[PDB]
Structures are given as structure tokens and as C-alpha cells.
Amino acid sequence: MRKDDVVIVTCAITGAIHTPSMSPYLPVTPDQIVEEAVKAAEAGAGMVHIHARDPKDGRPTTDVEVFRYICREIKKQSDVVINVTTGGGGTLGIPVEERAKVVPALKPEIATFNMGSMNFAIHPLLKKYKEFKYDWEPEYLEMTRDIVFRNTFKDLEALSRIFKENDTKPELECYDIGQIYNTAFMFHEGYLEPPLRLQFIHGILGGIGTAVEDVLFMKQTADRLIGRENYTWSLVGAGRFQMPLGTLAVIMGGDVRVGLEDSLYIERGKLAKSNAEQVEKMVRIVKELGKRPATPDEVREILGLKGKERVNF
Amino acid sequence: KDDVVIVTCAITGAIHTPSMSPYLPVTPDQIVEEAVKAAEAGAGMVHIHARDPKDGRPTTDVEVFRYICREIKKQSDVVINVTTGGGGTLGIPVEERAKVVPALKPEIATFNMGSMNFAIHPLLKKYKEFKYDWEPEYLEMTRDIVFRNTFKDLEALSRIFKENDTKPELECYDIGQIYNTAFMFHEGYLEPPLRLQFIHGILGGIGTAVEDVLFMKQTADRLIGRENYTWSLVGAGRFQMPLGTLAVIMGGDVRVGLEDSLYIERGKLAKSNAEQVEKMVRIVKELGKRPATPDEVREILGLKGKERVNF
Amino acid sequence: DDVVIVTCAITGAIHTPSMSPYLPVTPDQIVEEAVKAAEAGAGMVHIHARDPKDGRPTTDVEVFRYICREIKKQSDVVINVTTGGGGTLGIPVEERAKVVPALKPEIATFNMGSMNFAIHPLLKKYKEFKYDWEPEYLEMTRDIVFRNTFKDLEALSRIFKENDTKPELECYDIGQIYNTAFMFHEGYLEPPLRLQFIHGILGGIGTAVEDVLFMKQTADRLIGRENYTWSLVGAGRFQMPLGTLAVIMGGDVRVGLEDSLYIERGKLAKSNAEQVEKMVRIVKELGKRPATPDEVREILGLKGKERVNF
Amino acid sequence: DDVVIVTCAITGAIHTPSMSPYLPVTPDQIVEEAVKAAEAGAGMVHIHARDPKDGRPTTDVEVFRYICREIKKQSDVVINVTTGGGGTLGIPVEERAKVVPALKPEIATFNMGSMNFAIHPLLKKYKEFKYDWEPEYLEMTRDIVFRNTFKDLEALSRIFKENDTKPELECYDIGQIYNTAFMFHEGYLEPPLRLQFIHGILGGIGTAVEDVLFMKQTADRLIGRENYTWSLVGAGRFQMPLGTLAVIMGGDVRVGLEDSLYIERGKLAKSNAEQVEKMVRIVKELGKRPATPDEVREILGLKGKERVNF
Ligand SMILES: [Zn+2]
């Protein structure tokens, strides 16, 4: 049972979708990711969501030593909840058993747990960006035209066990209705321990879109398959749907995720200068609606997390 | 008129295995006989997979397809809808599975609209004894096989279908795949009017709630346009007749068959594909409608004719 | 969940005699049609009274008494008495409710809000009427509220309890489900509730699949799936499609000449039984079966045929 | 698709004077609050009249005349005049409509069905009233129909047209959207239509996100996306979240002490402007801005401030 006026704001710092040449404010190096996470926390993000990128050229990497560095350095400066991706790399065809290695290495409090195999395509960005600092960038974007983001039921069974072994909470990423169905199945099969934490992700080419209809239907599907008393949820709107759909989520009693991982913009046609800028905006809206951002320790109590110092970094 | 319903019958598929029902058609001759029976019962279109004649194992073998399609056409003017999905749950990619279309040049063929989990390993808790070793191996392997249909695959497939004058039947198992369909349509790969099929109840896809069906259809109206497509629905298993009837109430078309359910009623095996067709036709008729003849299927879906297929 | 309650609504107050020679008008016609409906598989029949002389709707509790007495002599069917009939003539709940103490039925209708309820467009479809009352009645629905205020509802809730009569809570709109939830949460309506969704009335919600799903979802969300069961009425040509929909969704269904005069497009239904026979064929194709009257009593927790006051 | 019409409903007929010292009740109070709302970014203000001495709701056209004249002297704000006010005292449309011929406003409310409209539960929250009329009024609404029959609406449509006043079509339920669809198709209502969805009245549709979306979808499906525009009213604590939802969905929004006495839970709004300022802040965070009164006129096709009869 949680307070009806406290909203968890998550800030997704860099991701794997956007590339350096798309915005000079996309955090690329590990130290940039660290500083932007700490700034996001100080702006009201009770949780930060972390991917690694190669410092030399910003290319996505699964390297757990880069994760280890980033997470340790954030923890030195902040009590923010550090949520680690196990999805990062998937758009480069990297399997779950390799993506998942960050969980036993770092034993984070919470990490992402993607709930189905899907197309996950950003090749259309090649129409929008013509020149790139690095050769890897347009190659990466093109290759997503034929790469499956793979998360089979066999993968998910093994992942559920890995999370339990390292006392890591799954944040169950759902990009379509079928993936909520997948979530219900794994829950009812005993693999996922309640209360579940779901995140609804809207606007991926290969997933569900960004209509108000889509958001409502996702949440109602979770209510009816899983049961309201058995889960909490957050939402991501891609790109310019970040603030409108995030606001919808809050109105519906959900939590919200913002961050340069999901959108490079602060307004129509205006690049966000930092993660903190989007966090400050969403906090202003949360407060107009008579709510407030959760502190990191509130996030821990709300999601039942193990504690900032019970991690392996 | 809004009083004609296309009733499609999916004869064997690739999900059910022989040991699950002695009435699942296995051999090429069984599949032919059953298709022709389904047609005579009011299925204006039949949907065909191939199986290894020896043991029923799904196969892409084009020469089995050719034999089956040739033999159906010799007995019936039924519209023959060929799979390019069969083999997908064994990890065979679109490039291989699509070769039936340039070979046979069918009037219509299936065209799966996204990559997904497609899992039937739970069937192992229901069936313990199998005539063939391949059957439980296959069920188990689906726990870890992606039914792969990437945007690259789909661009290639769109061209293959156009090059052979084969209409795509766009199989959508989830809301995301209707979004994928809208993308491919707007990009210019898929020619309108589109033919969609909503498939409910696959582990890895959307479920079988009335909510699910309505939302799929509303998503197509909203992204594609109510005028720019027609649609059919498949309800897996015991949801076959109720969801098929729902589709009819909603102005859609319906698909039945042993590919999709082994049963005629809770606990009772269907003895043929024709039995399920006869039932659905009775339901259609009580709702004031009638099944489409094959030639009405051709008119409604803009198909080339049986004279122009390569069998 | 393989039993469906099929109700047959025998005559109502909306259709008038000159619209169809098959609409039951006299008390004896209504009785006989109710009995045939029951024999066709309707476990419950729904009754309105009409004037024997010209078929004008009437609330006369003594006409109700004759009709219900005579049905019960011939059949164990559950007899559902209207407390809505007369409402489209401007007659308020206080008068319409008098049937409940008079007859103490097992179940009676209980309408869940005030609304416009207009059938004046029927004057565009029928230009010749045997009786002067028919077109005057139709025209006056243009300016008559079907009145069921919260005061009315509170009084009615008590009247039903005093007579051990189960409410069948008639909802014609989403607002009326909200009213139901209110009356339930306030303590006036004893669960489990029986609701009926009425689709197609001008002044009410329409006949889209969307409308039906949204009504049922609204009740699930406000009242709770565990706290109610439901039936559906589709008006006119929507009778069979929406009824079939309701069965697919796990609801019960109501048919009858009260709700539609037709058996198919352009063809008058020759009797209530014709409609029940057809809905029963559909129910059976969907692997279900009609509830017998005693199954209806068990499902809805009804007091039994011997405990009524007729 | 970046301009949002923010309407402020200054006083209404639901809340009573003793519920908040900040509810405007005298004519001059109403004028002053209307101007402050306009200055805060309300391009339109919605006006009811109240008795100058006891604050009771009143239809008196000469009170409306003074109020609207005095507002227009100070502000070019668009003045929306109620034809619903008095309905909860049982006053019928024919009487409530007289303000339209008298004042020929640019825009006026046009309520789209008969309904329960009950505020007796306010007696649980407010125990002391300065006037006897206040608790009496609230209790009586338990048993008063808010009457708006099809005959009424036919008459009202001619009145609006005769005075070159745009109908703002108030829908409190799904059936009322169906009613709007009918009156449109019958030729009574001139497109493009202006609808307003009212959420939270006891007797109407509630305040769920589901309710809002289903109202808007029904209007799209029945009337056509291109044939209407819409505004939304969330009652009470739902004012801001539902108004924000409306903005997200492309709709316009109404605030004001008519609909909520509060600026935040447990904190009384000290003025209409306080609610307007808040909504306007929310609009701007969502990358939009409030309409000026002249933009309201252009967006809705209003005749202009110089063409009213005050
Ligand atoms: Zn991520």
C-alpha cells in the first residue's frame, strides 16, 4: 500500500538508441553518464536508468567493467536507486545470457527485464540524420532493420532465476499487449515474484504506439491479467510523446520515466541540454497535479528494494 | 453485400502434432481430401501447410505443396491460401519459407507481420505419449525459438508477393504488428485494400478476451482506415467459435479448422475440418448472413483467379 | 458457465397494436404467449399489462394479477413484473411500484435513472393506426421524461425488500451504472446485484459492440465482478446480434416482441416463441443451454414460485 | 494545435454561498471575478445569475443583463450564458432559455438530456448554512429532474439560431452524445458542433480516465472527427487532472469555482483566477498556450462582442 500522492520519477540517462551525432548533449563517456545521473537525482529523479557506452566513440557496450565504474561513481555521490539495463546490446543482436551478466557482477537493486522477442527498428532515423561523426552510427541504425531484440520464454526463465540469485528486482519492460500476456504467464507459472514492477514503453517501431488508447489498454490489460493489487507501473513515451504520455501516466496513478535515452528534446524542435532539464519539467507537472517526486529511499520502500549498500559496487 | 461472410478453413497447420488427434490431417492426400470437404461445407478459402508424409513433421517442401495444391484445384474451385509462416516455429527464416510463392504463384498467401515468441511447450503437460520422437522435441524447442519476421524480411516478402501476383494475408498477433502493418503500408511496400487477419491466443501474442479482438480491430481502423482494409480472425482452441462469431457480429470474416482447434465442443475432438465449417456456417446463417463462394472470395479480395496459379 | 438465462419480454409498452398483429394485447394473449415462450426455453418471462379493449399500456395491478395468476397455473416459469411500464406515459415510480406489494413477485424491473425515452420517430414508419391513442402516445414521448429520481429509487429499494422481490436493475446508459454503484455503496441494493443493459433507446446508449463492452466494463470496475450478474437487451434488429454478443461475453440474454417485432430484416416475428427458439439455437451452437425456471431461481437467488402473491 | 481555450465557470448553481466565502454571489462579485479570470488567461467565462440578496440561483434575465454588460465594459472576454441554471429547482427549458433572446450572447449552454442531477450528498459535508434556502435546495435535488426533452431541445435549437448564438452542447453521459448525434442528423444543430463533456455529476457519467476517453471516442464515431470540437469539465477534485487529460487528448478545458471550491485538496480556492492561473501553467508545460478571447471567437466562429444585446 503506497501514498496516492508520491510519484516515482525515473531518469533514463543515455540508452542505446540515440547516437552521439544526433545531439551534443547525449551523454557518451562513463564520466558524463555519472555526472548526468547525479544531476538527474538532484533534480528529483528517485531512480536512474543506466546503459554503458564505449568512451572512445559512444558506441553501446555491455562491458561490465564500464558498468561497474559508472555505478560505483554514481553511488559515491548519490543515494539514487541505480537501475541497470540488461536490454542494452539487444539491438546489436547480443543475447540475454550475455546481456544479463551485469546482474551477477554488480548485484544491483533493480535491473530491466524485457518481456518478449520483437522487431526493434530505428533505421528510419537515417532519413533524418545524414552526417555522422562516426562510421559505426549509420551502420548501427541500418542493422536494426534486420535484428531481432530477442527474449524467449527460455531466456526469461533463466533471467528470472538470475535476478532471484542476486537479490535484484525485475523491472519488466513491456512494449506491446502480448508482452503483458507474457508477463502474466511467467507470473502465474511462478517465475516472477509479486508485486511485479512493469514499465510500459510506447512508440518503438516493432512495438505499440503512442495513442492515449494504447496507454490505457496496456494498463487495463495488466489490471485484468495480473490484478491491480499485484503490480506497480511506470511508462515511457518515445520522443515528443515523453511529456504528454508521462503526464497521462501520472493522471492514471502511474509512475513516469523521462531522460535523454527516450527523447533528445525538451520541446518541439528543441534539444534538451541535459537529463536534468527533462526531470525538472516533469517534477513541475507532477507538483501541479498535487503530487511530489519520490526520494530514493521512498523508491526503495515503494518497490521493496534491498538497499543502496547491499549492491556489489 | 454486408451479408456475405468469408469462411476460411485452416486444414492442418504446424502447431498440433499427430499424436494429439487421429483426425489431424498428416499426409498430402489427407490434406487434399479434407480441404475439398471443407470447401463443400462452405469454406470459400482453405489454408494449407505441408507435412512430412512419413511422420507428419512440419515441412516447407515446395514439391509437397505443389502436389497438394494441384490436387485441390483438380477437385475444387476453392481459393487456396498457402502458408509462408509454416516452419517459422522450427526456426526456418522467411527467405526459405517464402520460396513457395515464386514456385506456385498462389492467389493468396500468409504474410506474418512481426517477430515474436511463439511457444507451445505447455502442450507437453497435456500430452505425455507420442507416436513419434520428433513431436515432444518440437514442442520443447518452441520454448526457445523466435518466430522471425524482421522489417528487412518483410520488405523482401512484399516484393516477392507483388512479383507473383499473390495477395498478402497480413497475419497480426498483437497490436504492435498492426502498427508494423501501418508502417509497411504507408512506406509503400503493401498495396491497399489490405487483408488483415487477427490471431488470438498464441503464447507470445495477444490473448482471447473480447477486449483484445475489439482493440485489434479499432487499432486497424485508426491506423489503416476503416475503408482501406478487410479482416478475418482466428480464435485458438476453445475460443474458435465464440471469437469467430464475435468477428461476424463485428462485420469481419472468420477462420476455423483443425490447424487452430482440435475440438468441436469442450472435451470432444472434431472428426474433420468440415465439421467445424458446418458449425460456423450455421452460426453465420442464424445471424442473417451466408458464406462466400470461392468466386465471391476472389471478387471481395481482388484475387487473380485459379487460372493464373502455377499448379 | 454453460447455462444461459433466456428471458422473453412478451409485449411491453413501446410497440403499439397497429404495428404488428402478432403483438400480444389482451391479458389472455399475454398469458398464452408467456407459456409458449417458457416451453420454447425462456426460463423467465417479462410482463407488462395492457388494456384489454385497445392495447393501451396500463399499470392496473388487477390486470397484472390475472395475467400472472394464469401463467403460474400453466407454467413454473419465473415471472418478472415491470415497474417501468407507464413511465413513457408520464406515470411516476410511486404508482408503477404498486404491483410489487400487490403481487409480491420473485423478481421485478427496477429502472436506474431519469431519461428521455422517445419513440416519436415511429410516426415516420407507421401512418395508419386502428386507435387514436397510438399516434398520440408516440408523439407525446417526445416530451415525457421516464422519471426515476434518487428519491424514487430509495423508496423502491425498500418496497422490493418489504415484498421479498429481487431487483432487476435496468441500465440504459453509463450514468445509470454509476447510479447503481451509488445505491449499492449507500446500502440500498443487496448483492449480488442483477443488472440488465438496455441498448438502442433514443435517450439511452446505442447498439455498438463498443457500447455493450463499455457498459459491462463499467459495472465490473464500479461494482466488482464478484458482486453482480447481468443480462442484455438489444432493441429492434440488434436483438439477436447483441444477444449473441452478451452470451459470448458470459452474460444472459433477453428477447421478445416487447423489444423487436421482427424475426429477420423486413419480416415480422409471428410469435414470442419464434424469437426464443432462434436465440436457443444460437446459445446451443455456442456450446451452452438455456436455464430452466428452477435454474433461474438458483442462479438469481429467488424465493420460489410458491412464495408469490398470485 | 498549440492554442487551448481555457473557460472559467464563475459561480454556477450547485455550490451555495455558505460553502465558501470566496464563491461569488452578488452581481458585482460575479463581474469582478469574471474580469480577474479573463486577465489570468480565460478566453471565455461561463456565467450563471444569483439573487442579489440571498445568493439563490435565479433565471432573472435582468440580473444576467447587468452582469454581462458590466463584464463587457471591462473585458473583451467571450461571455457564455447558461440556459441550464435553474434546472435543479425544476425550472424548465422554455423558462431558462429566455436569456438568449434577451441578451443574444455569442455562446450559451445547451443541455442535451433529461437526467437526475443530485447534490443532496453535499449536506454530509456542510452542516451550517447562513440561509434556510441552502439546505432546502440541496435536499430537494434528491427528487428534481434536470429536464431537457427532445421537444425542449427542438425549441431551444430555433431560439439559438434566431439570436445568432452558438450552442455549447453539454453532455453528461454517453446517451447524451447519442442524443446530440440524433439532433445533428435531424438538422436541428449546425456543424461544426461544440460539445462539452461533464464528468462527476451524481446522475451522470463519472470521472474515470475511461469515461473521458469513451465520451470523446463516441463523439468521433457518431458525429465525425471533423464535425465537432470539445471542452471538458471535471467536477471537484477531478478538475485539474481531467482538464489536463483533455489538453493531452487535444480538447479544451473548463475550470472555476462553479465546479470546484478548491485549489488543492483541503485548500479553498480564494478566486476563480487562482484556478485559471494553475491550468494555464499546466497548458504551457505541455507546450501549448491559452486562447485570447478573439482567438476563441475565431476558433468557434462566434459573431463578435459588438453583436450581443448588452
Ligand atoms: Zn534502457
Ligand SMILES: [Zn+2]
Ligand atoms: Zn497457418
Ligand SMILES: [Zn+2]
Ligand atoms: Zn419492460
Ligand SMILES: [Zn+2]
Ligand atoms: Zn453552468
